[PDB]
Structure 1
C-alpha cells in the first residue's frame, strides 16, 4: 500500500502527494520509454511506422491486440511486450547495459531473475530493475531537456510515439502506463509517467500506486485515471 504523485516543472516541484515518492518499484511497461530511445538511437527502430515485425507464439499472448503485426507506434499504444523483447534481443546485453548506465536509469540492475539468465528480456518485468517516482522524473527530464547521449531522431520519434491526447488549456499529454507485480494472489502495482507541454512549458509527472489486495482492474489504468484528475486540477491552478 502507498501512492505517489509528483509533478515538476524544470527545477520546481509543483506537487508531491503520497508516501512512496522515494520507493523504488519495477518500471514494468514504463520501461518502453527507455527502450524507445535505445531503439531509435541504435538504428534498430526507424520511424513511427517502421520496422513492422510479425507476432510469433500467439498461444502465450494474453491480450488480443498483441496478436497483430507491430511497429513503434502500435508498440507503445498496445504496450506490446513481445516487441520490446524482440528489440532487446537485437540490441544485445552489452549495448542494453550501456544504455541503461548512460541513462542512469533507477538502480541500473539488468541482471534479471535468479536462475534464469533472462536480464536482456525480463529485467524490467517485476525483476531486478527498479526505479522510484523521483527517479522517473529525473529520467524523463533528461529526455525533455535532451541531456542524454542519443540522436535527435531518438528524441523526436520517442516523443512522437508517446503522444496521447490534448488536455484542457492545450496541454499536450505524453506518457506511458505500466503494471508490475509485488513479490497466493497477484498484488499489482501501477505506473503512469510522462509530461504535459504547452508553448514553452513542460511539466514532468509520475504517478504510482501499490495495491494491498487483489484488484478487479489493471493497476496502471487506475494510476493513469487518478493521475489525469490530478493533472486536470494542477492545470486549473496553473492557469489562474
Structure 2
C-alpha cells in the first residue's frame, strides 16, 4: 500500500500524505493533460469539438465507448487512447520530444517499450516516461501560472476539456485520471499489479489549489486504481474545502 496525496495553493503546501511523494511512475492517462497543451499549441486540435476523428477497426477497443467518433472533449472524458495516438503521429517525434523537454515533464524519456521504436505512441502507457506526484504538482502549477511555452488558446482549451464538476461551496474541479501497470525490473514487462492517479486543481474566485493523488497496489484488485485514486481524492478535497471555508 504505497500512496501519496499532495495539495498546494500558490507556494504553500496545504496537505502532504503518504510515503511516495517523490517516487516516479508512468503518468498513464494523466499525460493527456500534456498532450492537450501540445495539440492546441501546435494547431492540430482546434477547439473543444474539433477535430472529430472516426473510429477505425484497427484500434484496440478496450472500452466500448471508444467505438464512437472522438473529439477533444470526448477524448478527455472517455480517456480515449487511440485519439492520443492519432495526435502524436501527427505531431511527429521531433515536436513530441520538443514539447516533453520544453515542459520538463518528469524523466523526459520517450523511447517507449524496450525493444520497439514505439515511444511516439506508447511512451506514457506504462513505458519509459515517468513522473512523480511532486513533479505533477510542479507541472500543474506551470499551467495555472502560465509558465509553459504554449499559447493562450492552449491554456484556455485544455482547461475547458479537463472540467469535471462543481464541488460543495462552488469550487470547480478540473482533473484527469490515469491507470497503469507496474513493470518488472529486468526486461521491464507489464504486471497485473495496478497503479493509478488523479491529478488536477479546484478553483473558486481568485483561488486555485492543485492536487495530485497516487496509489500503487501490492496485490491484484478488481477495480481500476485510478477510480480508487479519484474516489479518495474527492473525500480529501471535501474535507479540505471545509477547512478553507472556515
Range class of TM-score, shorter chain: over 0.9
Q: How does 1:9-88 map to 2 (within 5 A)?
A: 9-57=9-57, 60-88=60-88
Shift of 1:60: 2.2
Q: Deviations over 1:169-212 (max 9, x none)?
A: 11100000000000196100000000000000000000000000
Aligned residues: 240
Give distance in 2, aligned partners of 1:124 and 1:58. Answer: 20
Contact 1:137–1:204 at 8 Å: present in 2 too? yes
- Note if contact 1:190-1:220 (Cα within 8 Å) is conserved in structure 2: yes
Whole-angstrom distance in 1 between the partners of 2:75 and 2:59: 19
SS at match of 2:192: coil
Alignment partners' CA distance in 2, 1:30 and 1:196: 16
The root-mean-square deviation of aligned C-alpha atoms, in Å, is 1.0
Normalized against structure 2, the TM-score is what?
0.96
Aligned to 1:198: 204
Does structure 1 conserve the Cα–Cα contact (< 8 Å) formed by 2:47 and 2:157? Answer: yes
CA offsets per residue over residues 136-170 of structure 1, 9 Å max, x none? 00000000010111010000000000000000111
Answer whether contact 1:101 1:108 (CA < 8 A) is retained: yes
Contact 1:50 1:71 in 2 (8 A): yes
**Superposition deviation, residue 115 in structure 1:** 1.0
Contact 1:185 1:214 in 2 (8 A): no
Aligned with 1:58: secondary structure?
A: coil
SS for the counterpart of 1:159 is helix
Task: Report the CA distance between 1:57 and its aligned residue.
Answer: 2.2
- Contact kept, 8 Å, 1:2 with 1:19, in 2: the verdict is yes
Shift of residue 59 of structure 1? 6.8
Range 179-188 or range 213-222, more displaced? 179-188
Give, in angstroms, the shift of residue 58 of structure 1: 5.6
For residues 33-76 of structure 1, what are the alpha-carbon distances to aligned partners after superposition, in whole Å with 9 as ceiling and x for unaligned? 00000000000000000000001126721110000000000000
SS in structure 1 of the partner of residue 29 of structure 2: helix
CA distance in 2, matches of 1:147, 1:221: 30
* CA positional deviation for 1:107: 0.6
CA distance in 1, matches of 2:59, 2:211: 36
Q: Is the 8 A contact 1:53 1:71 kept in 2?
A: yes
Cα distance in 2 for partners of 1:210, 1:129 equals 17
Listed one character per residue, the Cα deviations across residues 112-143 of structure 1 (whole Å, up to 9, x for unaligned) are 11111011000000000000000000000000
Change (3 A) 1:59 1:9: closer
Q: Distance in 1 between matches of 2:173 and 2:146?
A: 18
Which of 162, 187, 212 is the equivalent residue of 2:193?
187
1:223 to 218, 229, 242: 229
